[PDB]
Amino acid sequence: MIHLYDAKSFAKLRAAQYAAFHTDAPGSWFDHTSGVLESVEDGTPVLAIGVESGDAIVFDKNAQRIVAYKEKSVKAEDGSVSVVQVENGFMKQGHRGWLVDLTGELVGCSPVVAEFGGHRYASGMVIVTGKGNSGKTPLVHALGEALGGKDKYATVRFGEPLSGYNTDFNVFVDDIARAMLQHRVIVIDSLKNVIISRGAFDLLSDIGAMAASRGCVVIASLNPTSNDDKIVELVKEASRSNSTSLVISTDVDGEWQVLTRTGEGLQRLTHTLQTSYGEHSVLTIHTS
Amino acid sequence: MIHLYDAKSFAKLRAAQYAAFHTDAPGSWFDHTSGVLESVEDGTPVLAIGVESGDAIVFDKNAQRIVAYKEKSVKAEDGSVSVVQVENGFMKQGHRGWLVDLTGELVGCSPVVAEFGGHRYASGMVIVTGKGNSGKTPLVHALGEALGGKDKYATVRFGEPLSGYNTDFNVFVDDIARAMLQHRVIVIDSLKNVIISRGAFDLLSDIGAMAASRGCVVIASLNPTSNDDKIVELVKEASRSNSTSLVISTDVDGEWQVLTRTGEGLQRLTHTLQTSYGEHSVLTIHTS
Amino acid sequence: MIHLYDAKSFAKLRAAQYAAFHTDAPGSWFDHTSGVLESVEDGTPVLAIGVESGDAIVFDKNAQRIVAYKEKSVKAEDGSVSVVQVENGFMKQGHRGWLVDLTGELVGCSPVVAEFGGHRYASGMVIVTGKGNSGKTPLVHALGEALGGKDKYATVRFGEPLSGYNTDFNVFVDDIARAMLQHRVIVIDSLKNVIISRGAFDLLSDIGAMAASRGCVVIASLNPTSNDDKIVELVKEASRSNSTSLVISTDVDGEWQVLTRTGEGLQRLTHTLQTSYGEHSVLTIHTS
Amino acid sequence: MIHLYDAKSFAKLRAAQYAAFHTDAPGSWFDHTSGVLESVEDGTPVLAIGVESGDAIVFDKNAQRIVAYKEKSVKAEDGSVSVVQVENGFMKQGHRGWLVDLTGELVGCSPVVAEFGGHRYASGMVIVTGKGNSGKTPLVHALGEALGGKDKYATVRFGEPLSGYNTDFNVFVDDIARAMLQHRVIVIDSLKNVIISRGAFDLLSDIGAMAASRGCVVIASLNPTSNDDKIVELVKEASRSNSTSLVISTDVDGEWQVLTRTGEGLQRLTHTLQTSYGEHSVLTIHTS
Amino acid sequence: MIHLYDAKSFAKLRAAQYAAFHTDAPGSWFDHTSGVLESVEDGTPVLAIGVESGDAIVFDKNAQRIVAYKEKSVKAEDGSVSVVQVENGFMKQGHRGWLVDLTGELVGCSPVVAEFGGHRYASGMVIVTGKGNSGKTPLVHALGEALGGKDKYATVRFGEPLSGYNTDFNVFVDDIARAMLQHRVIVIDSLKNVIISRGAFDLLSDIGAMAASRGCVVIASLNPTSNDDKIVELVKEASRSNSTSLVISTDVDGEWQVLTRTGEGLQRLTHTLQTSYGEHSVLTIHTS
Amino acid sequence: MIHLYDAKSFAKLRAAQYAAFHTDAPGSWFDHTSGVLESVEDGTPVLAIGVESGDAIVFDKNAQRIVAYKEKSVKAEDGSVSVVQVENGFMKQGHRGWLVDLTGELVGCSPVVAEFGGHRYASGMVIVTGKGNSGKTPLVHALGEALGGKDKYATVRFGEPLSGYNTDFNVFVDDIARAMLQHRVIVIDSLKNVIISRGAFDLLSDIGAMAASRGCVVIASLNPTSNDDKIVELVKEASRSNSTSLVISTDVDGEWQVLTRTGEGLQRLTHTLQTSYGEHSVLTIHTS
Ligand SMILES: Nc1ncnc2c1ncn2[C@@H]1O[C@H](COP(=O)(O)OP(=O)(O)O)[C@@H](O)[C@H]1O
Ligand SMILES: Nc1ncnc2c1ncn2[C@@H]1O[C@H](COP(=O)(O)OP(=O)(O)O)[C@@H](O)[C@H]1O
Ligand SMILES: Nc1ncnc2c1ncn2[C@@H]1O[C@H](COP(=O)(O)OP(=O)(O)O)[C@@H](O)[C@H]1O
Ligand SMILES: Nc1ncnc2c1ncn2[C@@H]1O[C@H](COP(=O)(O)OP(=O)(O)O)[C@@H](O)[C@H]1O
Ligand SMILES: Nc1ncnc2c1ncn2[C@@H]1O[C@H](COP(=O)(O)OP(=O)(O)O)[C@@H](O)[C@H]1O
Ligand SMILES: Nc1ncnc2c1ncn2[C@@H]1O[C@H](COP(=O)(O)OP(=O)(O)O)[C@@H](O)[C@H]1O
Ligand SMILES: [Mg+2]
Ligand SMILES: [Mg+2]
Ligand SMILES: [Mg+2]
Ligand SMILES: [Mg+2]
Ligand SMILES: [Mg+2]
Ligand SMILES: [Mg+2]
């Protein structure tokens, strides 16, 4: 909804956004939204995401699809009304994104999702890209494991000519939706087939905000299939724009640069990652 | 409608347009249109704005959507007829923009919305853009607070991968419509996802005129996601064209240039803004 | 319709076309067509113009829209048949343009619309363009007043982010239609939003001929929002092509060049205009 | 239909095609096809041409439109079947072009349409183009009068911002159809608005063959509104391709070059035209 | 259908494909397929070809169109099923191309269609192109007569502004279908209007295979209307790709180069042709 | 579906993926999936592939098309549901690709399909491309025979102007589907007509994953019809991206480079192939 501010309430907002990344316990936002989701009335639509055509499918708190749901409205503090209606498996009324409020007044954050190697990482979408045909796949997996920490990370596979890989966009958004509804750390191996259909365009536009609001973090590989020219600059550009954080390869083997948006109007941070391969190409990110 | 003029009535018009920016009390036009709006017959359609498809949704004076409204015509002094009809939540007959006359004979103005730091600022749409990845967000907020003055400013969030950010275009125009119907100072953080769908194109084309007629002022961030080439010149160009005022970054840190259209065929003005950051990236615009 | 000629009747035609610009009393064609229009059977469709979709709306002699009109045919001298039919507010059968004959055998003229400062000006469409972000607006208004002479000129406002400006294309063509049906001198401030929809393309293609046939003159501002490169050459080009007359800015402040098509296959004329600003940006065109 | 040949019948065909341009009396083919048309059963569809949408309207021998015609088939010598069916004013079955056979075995000709100034001119389509903004209009008219000889030439006006000019494509094809059904010499002033809609594309593709088959000759002005660059080379190119003859301006004032296709696989001829202006821009083509 | 091979059966296939061009009696494949076609059950669909829309029309062995045909399936050795169904004049089920098997296991051939001047020529599609505005027409005709040998060749005329020339794409494919069903040597004068509609694209993609399977040879003129730049290289490229054989003009007057694909994975051959003009532009290809 | 991992289960996965290419017996995966397929309930949909329109057709284990299949759902370990429904010959519900699980937890492999000349070759899709108009056809066949080893390889022919070649995209996917359901080694001669329709785009996106999952290997020829410029770099690029393995021609006659993806995030391997022609263009790949 819309929010009103004067100097004083704006300064409080910024302080809270700053704390959401810098001082809140890592993964606390995720635990908080998981709590909000489980308190959702059984059967209530909680998430809507676009499929290939541009239409949207809807899920409940247990990541089960909703196919029929009689129109229901909700009045916000803003005075604005929220309406949701599902019919024949598709949203008849509503909007893409979260259908229940996970944030309230606290918006514009990049909730800390985890801490590793002396650095805090933001929830939201992280695109791993850069100098083509490098080791993006091993990197998204190492990041997944490291950010997972005590927990397992979820892997969404899509659009690679390898065994067991789904290449149908509608199965892909179904996996993404389930992943965000159930896990704090998600890896998407290849946003290749995505970047264009309306559903695909919808995804690039919505995923970061959906993850950041949940407090989960989606680590997506984007190997520029495009030339190995300066088209990689445009890819990086498009990526910076729809990503909460960016991870780009450098001219130094095994080294990557992490660029993080810490919150609305807040400072962008950067740190470097050193990595190395073990057996069977398992990559390890060096810490101390 | 159309207006007729001879030398004498034209000179009077220009004098009045000149006064609307230069000598009228800041925010007086807004107060006046608020008065016109509240005297509108209950239930009367007052504003129509386009959604993603190109269709338009309609609101009443209290920023509540109208879904059903039997056809109604109105004869203007011009002899032209205005017809409005809403059905199934969409305008069946009418036009995008204000559906009740807020201006009358007094058109082509950039009604002073506020005065700050020795400068008068126009109502209408203000696009904040320029040299990519700068501090556009902190700037739109500081401008919002400063122009708000004694009042709070309204913030419309859209299309950024941060918590609580709507990324659905139809929710976006709903937020904009409510904002203009209810507040004199409005901030839109990111016209990114907009600049293309018909609704988006409609918005760029309509928003400035809608705001200027209301006397409100919409301060919109436009971070060129495009290259950091001379595509920024085209962005600036597109922005100049659909903006009442333009605010662009310069080669000097914290400095911005404000270019203002003071009214139809009137002189374009320019002044500079100096700014600095405080705690939690709160930006302050220097005055004296 | 089609016309047949041998050397003799062709020489007569050219003489008459030459007289229509050079020797007929200024504005006499307009008065003549006004006469033809008022002698039109009440309720008869007299003008059809395209709306955004490409469909056309129809007006009667009093500039009132026709929504229902049973099919009616008319046999021309040519042997060709003219059919008009309106249904549900849209032309079911007919063509864009004048639906009653205002010219007869006398076609291919640029009927003198007025004389000012020692020069005769043609009816039809006049596009004021050139070296971007100049004083096009003040110029179209000064030209409007000057060509109006004893009469007031009609102003059609469209697509500018200023108070009271319509930005809906369908209201725009409605204003244009009323303007041409009722006034000899018309000013269109900004063909910006137009130059693309089918309605818009229809307008560029039809307006000049409609005005020339009526004997009215439409003075349209066209500020190339495009680069300030040599794209202005293409704009000028597109403008020359659909304009009866062109008015372009020069490298000399306040100076403009007027290029006029005096009629079918006749000589194109050129003269220069000197102008200066007064109070509140009112522009004056120097004469003697 | 298709035709079979061996060396002997092919040599006869070429001889006949050669005679159709070089030795047949000028305009004899036209008189012959007029005879074929008048012997057509009353009400029989004789010509189909495409309108803007790509659909086709159909005419009878008197240039009257057919709106209803029950399906009718015809078996050709080729074994191929020709079917025509009109419904609701549009061809339901058939093809664009002549619906009755005007040629028989004699195809691939450029039937001499007239002789003037010591040169024979082909029927078919003649595009007058070249070095932009020249005197194309005066030239098509002089050619019209000269080729008309003892007869008057027909003028089809279209898409110029001048009085009485139709700018609706569907009225345009109606004029062209009537013109070819009734006159040997036709002038089209401006193929501008045409060169793109399907109807327009259909016209460029069909007009030459339709005229050549009738033995009439359409002299069409094509002023490249495009740049005055080497885009004129592409225009000329597109023109050469769909024209039976080309008439292009040269670097010498009043001089034009005529390039003629004399028939299928036959020699292309070229000759030059000298012209000069008289009173009221009437152009005269010098002969002896 | 699909075919299985091991080293031995593959070597046999290549030997047979080699023989189909190099040692089989010229035109023997055509005679063989003519035999297969005449043994087809009366009324059986034998050929399907696409019309402008992308839909397909169907013919029987006598080149008569089929408009109604109840669904019928056929099981191949491959296990694959072939289904054909015609309704309302269009294929409801089936595929473009031959609907009865003319080849069996013997596929990937360029069956010798004729021998002339010491060279064997392949069946399939032959595109005659190169250095624009040359003598492509005279060449396709001389080739048609020479390859015809004892038989007449069939001429399909299309898209040229000359008398009797069809310019409707749907009549064109009807002519092509009949030609291939009935003659071993076919000339198409101008693939101009074709190279784009779906039917046209279908034709470029299907014609070579259809002809090669029949054993007939289609000699098509392709005059690049495009620039006379190096766009001719792209034309040649597109032509090489969809042609069984290519015939291109050279820098030497009257000389042409013939490039032939002799079969699947077999050697491409080249030889030169010398030609000269006789009376009425009849071209003769020199032999001994 | 999605998979969860911690460091330990991820290391096991990589080990198993490494074994799937490096140590499993060649062709063992194919035999395994053949087993899974034959244990599939009779009539069960096992494969869905897209046709030209973008819709998908469905096959059973015996490569027979399914036209009617009442909706059936399946709950995965993931919690995700799989639904399949066929109606009127098209998938009403489901996804493109394998409809029964052939992989389970073991995904992201490039199952060894065969071993020849001291090298192991991956299943999945292999595109043979490079320096235009070379010997791609002979190469795909030699590779087919060699990888077939003791078995015959299946050949799918498409879009070449040669006898017996299908050029209809829908017959093409039917052949591909049957080939993958029934053979371990498949050759597709020409992906030309493919690289664009939605079906075609679907194929490029799906084929590699389908083959890799089955453990079969599709050897597809891709002769860049495009320029012989550096467009071949883009072709190679697009090819690398959707291929499990790439085979490219080099500057050395008869030599080719094989680039293999050995599995998810695993090392890409490269080796060289030397070849030579025998009688009738049969190509032999040198081993020892
Ligand atoms: N042990 C290793 N040492 C060096 N490079 C490796 C090792 N293991 C894997 N790689 C690289 O990791 C990448 C494999 O994952 P893949 O997804 O195909 O790459 P990409 O990130 O280019 O899309 C390849 O570029 C491969 O060469
Ligand atoms: N205290 C600060 N000092 C300097 N720069 C800051 C400070 N705080 C925030 N910024 C800058 O403000 C911007 C953050 O807002 P954001 O919307 O992401 O930027 P942008 O205007 O480029 O779209 C970043 O470019 C960030 O680096
Ligand atoms: N008194 C004046 N002296 C010089 N320039 C003026 C004066 N008044 C107005 N202008 C110029 O007239 C133009 C205002 O009308 P506007 O429609 O916005 O311009 P444009 O023709 O570029 O589209 C501006 O470019 C403005 O700077
Ligand atoms: N008497 C004349 N002397 C020289 N030029 C003339 C004369 N009369 C007309 N013209 C030229 O003929 C042309 C007028 O016809 P028009 O259709 O507008 O031209 P175009 O062929 O460029 O499209 C103009 O270019 C005009 O300047
Ligand atoms: N006797 C001849 N001598 C030289 N050239 C000739 C002769 N007869 C015809 N031609 C050429 O043959 C061609 C005519 O056929 P056409 O189809 O129009 O040509 P194109 O192959 O360029 O499309 C022309 O280029 C013409 O100049
Ligand atoms: N014996 C041979 N010696 C050299 N080249 C050969 C031999 N046999 C066939 N070729 C080449 O193999 C190719 C034939 O197969 P084709 O599919 O048409 O080629 P491409 O791979 O270019 O698409 C041709 O380029 C041909 O010249
Ligand atoms: Mg990857
Ligand atoms: Mg911003
Ligand atoms: Mg202006
Ligand atoms: Mg002209
Ligand atoms: Mg030709
Ligand atoms: Mg090949």
Coordinates of N, CA, C and O and ligand atoms in Angstrom, one line a residue, chain E residues 14 260-269, chain F residues 128 130-140 160 162 165 189-190 192 221-224 253 256 276-283, ligand 6:
Chain E
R14 N 24.0 -45.3 -49.5 CA 24.8 -44.3 -50.2 C 25.1 -44.8 -51.7 O 25.0 -44.0 -52.6
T260 N 25.3 -28.3 -58.2 CA 24.4 -29.3 -57.9 C 24.7 -30.2 -56.7 O 25.8 -30.7 -56.5
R261 N 23.6 -30.4 -55.9 CA 23.7 -31.4 -54.8 C 23.3 -32.7 -55.4 O 22.2 -32.8 -55.9
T262 N 24.2 -33.7 -55.5 CA 23.9 -34.9 -56.1 C 23.2 -36.0 -55.2 O 22.8 -37.0 -55.7
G263 N 23.0 -35.6 -54.0 CA 22.4 -36.5 -53.0 C 22.9 -36.3 -51.6 O 23.8 -35.6 -51.4
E264 N 22.1 -36.9 -50.7 CA 22.4 -36.8 -49.2 C 23.9 -37.1 -48.8 O 24.4 -38.2 -49.0
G265 N 24.6 -36.1 -48.3 CA 26.0 -36.3 -48.0 C 26.9 -36.5 -49.2 O 28.1 -36.8 -49.0
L266 N 26.4 -36.5 -50.4 CA 27.2 -36.7 -51.5 C 27.9 -35.4 -52.0 O 27.6 -34.3 -51.5
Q267 N 28.8 -35.6 -53.0 CA 29.6 -34.5 -53.5 C 28.7 -33.5 -54.2 O 27.8 -33.8 -54.9
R268 N 29.1 -32.2 -54.0 CA 28.4 -31.1 -54.7 C 29.2 -30.9 -56.0 O 30.4 -30.8 -56.0
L269 N 28.5 -30.8 -57.1 CA 29.2 -30.6 -58.4 C 29.0 -29.2 -59.0 O 28.0 -28.6 -58.6
Chain F
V128 N 26.3 -30.8 -34.3 CA 27.4 -30.8 -35.1 C 27.2 -29.6 -36.0 O 26.3 -29.4 -36.8
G130 N 29.5 -25.6 -37.3 CA 30.7 -24.9 -37.6 C 30.8 -24.4 -39.1 O 29.9 -24.4 -39.8
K131 N 32.0 -23.9 -39.4 CA 32.4 -23.3 -40.7 C 31.5 -23.9 -41.8 O 31.8 -25.0 -42.4
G132 N 30.4 -23.2 -42.1 CA 29.4 -23.6 -43.1 C 29.8 -24.4 -44.3 O 31.0 -24.6 -44.6
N133 N 28.7 -25.0 -44.9 CA 28.8 -25.9 -46.1 C 30.0 -26.9 -46.1 O 30.7 -27.0 -47.1
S134 N 30.2 -27.5 -44.9 CA 31.2 -28.5 -44.8 C 30.6 -29.9 -44.9 O 29.5 -30.1 -45.5
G135 N 31.2 -30.9 -44.3 CA 30.7 -32.3 -44.4 C 30.0 -32.7 -43.1 O 30.4 -33.7 -42.5
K136 N 29.0 -31.9 -42.7 CA 28.2 -32.2 -41.5 C 27.4 -33.5 -41.6 O 27.4 -34.3 -40.7
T137 N 26.8 -33.6 -42.8 CA 26.0 -34.8 -43.0 C 26.8 -36.1 -42.9 O 26.3 -37.0 -42.1
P138 N 27.9 -36.2 -43.5 CA 28.7 -37.5 -43.4 C 29.2 -37.7 -42.0 O 29.2 -38.8 -41.6
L139 N 29.5 -36.6 -41.3 CA 29.9 -36.7 -40.0 C 28.8 -37.2 -39.0 O 29.1 -38.2 -38.2
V140 N 27.6 -36.7 -39.1 CA 26.6 -37.2 -38.1 C 26.3 -38.7 -38.4 O 26.1 -39.4 -37.4
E160 N 15.4 -30.7 -45.9 CA 16.5 -30.6 -46.9 C 15.7 -30.8 -48.2 O 14.8 -31.7 -48.3
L162 N 15.7 -32.7 -50.7 CA 16.1 -34.0 -51.2 C 14.9 -35.0 -51.2 O 14.0 -34.8 -50.4
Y165 N 12.3 -36.4 -48.0 CA 12.5 -35.6 -46.8 C 11.3 -34.9 -46.3 O 10.7 -34.1 -47.0
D189 N 19.1 -35.3 -39.4 CA 19.8 -34.5 -40.4 C 19.0 -33.3 -40.7 O 18.0 -33.3 -41.4
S190 N 19.6 -32.2 -40.2 CA 19.2 -30.9 -40.2 C 18.2 -30.3 -39.3 O 17.0 -30.6 -39.4
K192 N 18.0 -27.4 -39.5 CA 18.0 -26.2 -40.3 C 16.6 -25.5 -40.3 O 16.5 -24.3 -39.8
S221 N 22.6 -32.3 -37.0 CA 23.4 -31.4 -38.0 C 22.8 -30.0 -37.9 O 21.5 -29.9 -37.9
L222 N 23.6 -29.0 -37.9 CA 23.2 -27.7 -37.9 C 24.1 -26.9 -38.8 O 25.2 -26.4 -38.4
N223 N 23.7 -26.8 -40.1 CA 24.5 -26.1 -41.1 C 24.1 -24.6 -41.0 O 23.0 -24.3 -41.4
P224 N 24.9 -23.7 -40.5 CA 24.5 -22.3 -40.5 C 24.3 -21.8 -41.9 O 25.2 -21.6 -42.7
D253 N 41.1 -29.9 -42.7 CA 40.3 -30.8 -43.4 C 40.0 -32.2 -42.7 O 41.0 -32.8 -42.3
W256 N 37.6 -32.5 -36.5 CA 36.5 -31.9 -35.7 C 36.9 -32.0 -34.3 O 37.6 -32.8 -33.8
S276 N 38.0 -39.4 -42.7 CA 38.3 -39.5 -44.1 C 37.2 -40.1 -44.9 O 36.4 -40.9 -44.4
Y277 N 37.1 -39.7 -46.2 CA 36.0 -40.3 -47.0 C 36.4 -41.6 -47.7 O 37.6 -41.8 -48.1
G278 N 35.4 -42.4 -48.0 CA 35.6 -43.6 -48.7 C 34.7 -43.5 -49.9 O 34.4 -42.4 -50.4
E279 N 34.3 -44.6 -50.5 CA 33.4 -44.6 -51.7 C 32.1 -44.1 -51.3 O 31.6 -44.3 -50.2
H280 N 31.5 -43.4 -52.3 CA 30.1 -42.8 -52.2 C 30.0 -41.9 -50.9 O 29.0 -41.9 -50.3
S281 N 31.1 -41.2 -50.7 CA 31.1 -40.2 -49.5 C 30.9 -40.8 -48.1 O 30.5 -40.1 -47.2
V282 N 31.1 -42.1 -48.0 CA 30.9 -42.7 -46.7 C 32.1 -42.2 -45.9 O 33.3 -42.4 -46.3
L283 N 31.9 -41.6 -44.7 CA 33.0 -41.1 -43.9 C 33.3 -42.1 -42.8 O 32.5 -42.7 -42.2
Ligands
LIG6 N1 34.1 -37.8 -51.2 C1 34.0 -36.5 -50.7 N2 35.2 -35.8 -50.6 C2 35.1 -34.5 -50.2 N3 34.0 -33.9 -49.8 C3 32.8 -34.6 -49.9 C4 32.8 -36.0 -50.3 N4 31.6 -36.4 -50.3 C5 30.8 -35.4 -49.8 N5 31.5 -34.3 -49.5 C6 30.9 -33.0 -49.0 O1 29.9 -33.4 -48.0 C7 28.8 -32.4 -48.0 C8 27.5 -33.0 -48.4 O2 26.5 -33.0 -47.4 P1 25.6 -31.8 -47.1 O3 24.6 -32.1 -46.1 O4 24.9 -31.2 -48.3 O5 26.7 -30.7 -46.5 P2 26.6 -29.6 -45.4 O6 27.2 -30.4 -44.1 O7 27.5 -28.4 -45.8 O8 25.3 -29.2 -45.0 C9 29.2 -31.4 -49.1 O9 29.7 -30.1 -48.6 C10 30.1 -32.2 -50.0 O10 30.8 -31.3 -50.9

